[PDB]
Amino acid sequence: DNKVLHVYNWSDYIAPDTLEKFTKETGIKVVYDVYDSNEVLEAKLLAGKSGYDVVVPSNSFLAKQIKAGVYQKLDKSKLPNWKNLNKDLMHTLEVSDPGNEHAIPYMWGTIGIGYNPDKVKAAFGDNAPVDSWDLVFKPENIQKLKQCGVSFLDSPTEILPAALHYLGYKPDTDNPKELKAAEELFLKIRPYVTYFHSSKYISDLANGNICVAIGYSGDIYQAKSRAEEAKNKVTVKYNIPKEGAGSFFDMVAIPKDAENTEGALAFVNFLMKPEIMAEITDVVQFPNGNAAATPLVSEAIRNDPGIYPSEEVMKKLYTFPDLPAKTQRAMTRSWTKIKSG
Numbered sequence: 001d002n003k004v005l006h007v008y009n010w011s012d013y014i015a016p017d018t019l020e021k022f023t024k025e026t027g028i029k030v031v032y033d034v035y036d037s038n039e040v041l042e043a044k045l046l047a048g049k050s051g052y053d054v055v056v057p058s059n060s061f062l063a064k065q066i067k068a069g070v071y072q073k074l075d076k077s078k079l080p081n082w083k084n085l086n087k088d089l090m091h092t093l094e095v096s097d098p099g100n101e102h103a104i105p106y107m108w109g110t111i112g113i114g115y116n117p118d119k120v121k122a123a124f125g126d127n128a129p130v131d132s133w134d135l136v137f138k139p140e141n142i143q144k145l146k147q148c149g150v151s152f153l154d155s156p157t158e159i160l161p162a163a164l165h166y167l168g169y170k171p172d173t174d175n176p177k178e179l180k181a182a183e184e185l186f187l188k189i190r191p192y193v194t195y196f197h198s199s200k201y202i203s204d205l206a207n208g209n210i211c212v213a214i215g216y217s218g219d220i221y222q223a224k225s226r227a228e229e230a231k232n233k234v235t236v237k238y239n240i241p242k243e244g245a246g247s248f249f250d251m252v253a254i255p256k257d258a259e260n261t262e263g264a265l266a267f268v269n270f271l272m273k274p275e276i277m278a279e280i281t282d283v284v285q286f287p288n289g290n291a292a293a294t295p296l297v298s299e300a301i302r303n304d305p306g307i308y309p310s311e312e313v314m315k316k317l318y319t320f321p322d323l324p325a326k327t328q329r330a331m332t333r334s335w336t337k338i339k340s341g
Helices: 018-026 038-047 059-067 080-084 087-093 117-124 139-145 156-166 176-192 201-207 217-230 262-271 274-284 325-339
Strands: 004-010 029-035 103-115 150-152 212-216 237-239 245-253 317-319
Touching: 004 262, 018 029, 018 262, 018 274, 038 059, 059 245, 080 262, 087 103, 103 117, 103 156, 103 217, 103 262, 103 274, 117 139, 139 176, 150 201, 156 176, 156 245, 156 325, 176 325, 201 212, 201 217, 212 217, 217 237, 262 274
Parallel strands: 004 029, 150 212, 245 317
Antiparallel strands: 103 212, 103 237, 103 245
16 A cells, blocks of 8 residues: 555654645655664664665664665655755765665764753862763763763764774774773763663753763754753753764665555655755754755754854764674674673
8 A cells, every 4th residue: 555654763853744744745644653773773674574664774874784785776766856965965975875876864963962051060060071072981070970860872883982082093993902992981981871872861851850961962952942841940052072073864765675665755755845854953953964955944953053063063073884793793792781780
């Protein structure tokens, strides 16, 4: 039945009327499921017959899934809105997806420091280095924050590179000694981490349950917004630290065994409509991959350096690599050890 579409996307990553408008235009109903990690999506895909027509991996995982033959090539004649994509971004994405054959950029962002300034001051003292990775990777520092709660993503492939970076190593290093050093750094700060989770931190941060979350940029902006709408006195801020940060890029793609491919292509095309993509960015506060959409984004969002960064900040951002299996395996092993008491 080409009038039903099964989508699996990140949580907190669409506008509340996006699907209603898609169905209104197309008559295609959408069953929409959400995840908060690449690993969950990855396991589904690799096992095969996932039951989804559209999924949204990060670009690091997309590159690997493409080589593994997970996705079908997009029929670009069914995607007239392709013209709206930022061509410069599409060029950089060619490394992961030669000829941009399988996917389009949905949204992207950074992994940095979300925090509650009042709670940090009370716990830390005046002038906490809230604009620096030293805030959390210096044991004496995170120790002061243990009091109001510090979270990190449950995402080894995105968090261990922050440790690597902090130690002065390349964030895409495969060197076993550097990787191990990253693990040792985390073990030192681990007693002061309240939890590792990739979505729970939005509510906790908005509600005042924690005072620092190392998380996805747009997520922290949503927490800020929820806080403001709650009128419950919680102030949330986000910094891309002075030293730089990792940047992830999420990509829409179509599993080879998609039951409906025609509808999936319709959905992908619908997402490249300028006003549709801009409305999404307004709500979830991650920049998108659509040059035609930028002008239609609210100016407080488009003009915010934590969402659309300046050229100078861009130069300090790194991407997450297509990982060799041995590195992934080492990272997984470290992450199990780190998460556990």
